Each structure stands twice: as C-alpha cells, then as structure tokens.
Amino acid sequence: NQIDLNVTCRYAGVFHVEKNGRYSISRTEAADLCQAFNSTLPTMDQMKLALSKGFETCRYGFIEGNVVIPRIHPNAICAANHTGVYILVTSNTSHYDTYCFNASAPPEEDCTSVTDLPNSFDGPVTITIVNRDGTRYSKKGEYRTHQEDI
Numbered sequence: 001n002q003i004d005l006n007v008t009c010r011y012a013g014v015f016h017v018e019k020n021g022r023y024s025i026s027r028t029e030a031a032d033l034c035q036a037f038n039s040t041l042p043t044m045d046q047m048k049l050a051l052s053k054g055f056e057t058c059r060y061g062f063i064e065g066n067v068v069i070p071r072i073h074p075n076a077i078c079a080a081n082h083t084g085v086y087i088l089v090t091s092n093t094s095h096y097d098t099y100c101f102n103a104s105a106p107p108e109e110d111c112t113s114v115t116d117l118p119n120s121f122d123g124p125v126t127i128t129i130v131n132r133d134g135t136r137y138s139k140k141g142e143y144r145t146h147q148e149d150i
C-alpha cells in the first residue's frame, strides 16, 4: 500500500505534485492532497505569479477552477508551444496531476527539497515524497477523504 508523490520547487508557494508517475489524481483527491501539505489548490492569480517567478512544468494539473500547464519557454510537446498559464479546454478525461499552494513558502523560487507531509492523517499507506533531486521523505498515513478516490 504505497503512494509516490513527486514534488517540485515552490515558486511563490506554488508547486507541482505528480502521483505514482502518471496522471492519476481526481479534483477531489487533489484538494485533499494539497491539504496534506498544509496547502490549497492555487488560484489562477497565484499560479500566474508563480509563473512570473520561474515556474513551468510540462504536465497538466489542477488549480482552482481549471486544469493548466504553466509555460515559460515554448516547447512543441508542452501545451502545444504556448507560453503563460495554458488552460486545458477539451479533454475526455478527469485525472491529472495537481498544483498546490503553500502560503508559508518563500516568496520567489524555493528549490530546497520537501522533507515533510505535515498534515496527512492516520492511515495505512506508505506515502513517499520524492524530490527532483531524488531525496525522499516517507510516512505512514492517508490524505484521501473521499472513498471513491481510494
């Protein structure tokens, strides 16, 4: 019973979380997952400010109200060469990665590693936070409050 959570740098408190190396998070799960990091789904304004500080990914993830990819450099295989906060318009499917916003994070680029999952609750899952530099933090618990996400 294991969950891998790959996390990024935080940019103005915003970060990306990919679960189990594939698009696998529902919108309900995403809010619960961010809550475990004492975070919330970013607003579009928080995500735009993160982008301006250097945040970009090549993965769709939830924010409040939409599924987006923040892009700085045009790349043909990331949001069809678009820049800015690219908003997913048409998709058949519901599972993506998520973005989270931690208001207590530093104001600009924070590329230190994540070393805690501070607000997960008691549970049976071994949750491992995987940083881009490979460093890991694991803890037994749960963060999913909706049974349909389990």
Ligand SMILES: CC(=O)Nc1cccc(F)c1C(=O)O
Pocket: 010, 015, 037, 038, 102, 104, 105, 106, 114, 115, 116, 117, 118
């Ligand atoms: C203060 C701070 O940087 N908090 C965090 C940001 C992102 C993810 C996290 F788990 C945390 C934390 O509080 O450990």
